[PDB]
Design a binder for this molecule. Sequence first.
Ligand SMILES: Nc1nc2c(ncn2[C@@H]2O[C@H](COP(=O)(O)OP(=O)(O)O)[C@@H](O)[C@H]2O)c(=O)[nH]1
Ligand SMILES: [Mg+2]
Length: 169
Amino acid sequence: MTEYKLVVVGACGVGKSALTIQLIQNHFVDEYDPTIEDSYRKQVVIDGETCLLDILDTAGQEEYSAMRDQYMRTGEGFLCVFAINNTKSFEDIHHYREQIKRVKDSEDVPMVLVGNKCDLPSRTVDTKQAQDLARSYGIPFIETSAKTRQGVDDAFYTLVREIRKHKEK
Ligand SMILES: Nc1nc2c(ncn2[C@@H]2O[C@H](COP(=O)(O)OP(=O)(O)O)[C@@H](O)[C@H]2O)c(=O)[nH]1
Ligand SMILES: [Mg+2]
């Protein structure tokens, strides 16, 4: 019955939908419309706690900006995703970090930084660069592949653990 409201954000094409569908349905989707924004739910056990994950797979601009503000305010934790072969997507993390803090009007928002597509040979963002950014934010960094499932549970479960740490204070 404890529910965690998770929000997946990041530039178009980084694997937000693929990561979410891998977590929920345990398969890799080759093709999922980049413009579809939807929420998914699943019951999981995390550190012995049976809980419900309610995950919003975001798709960018909204019909009205109030819709963006609404999901950022109600969201409890944010998975900030870039792709390791797309430097622009890594640079865009700065924008998402700032915008979420701005809407929530808080310095302390549970977040995890995710470098997806680590199964690919092409890499433009080395691990050190991403670790340096995560260190500056004081948040965890996890490399994932939605295709092989590497790191997928860890990314989402770590985010839940970050929410728990925020709530106990
Ligand atoms: N090789 C590989 N491809 C991926 C991975 N994650 C996503 N993709 C592919 O990257 C493209 C964009 O993924 P998508 O989930 O639609 O990204 P979104 O726009 O962030 O929702 C799709 O063609 C996916 O098949 C991954 O971890 N490895
Ligand atoms: Mg998508």
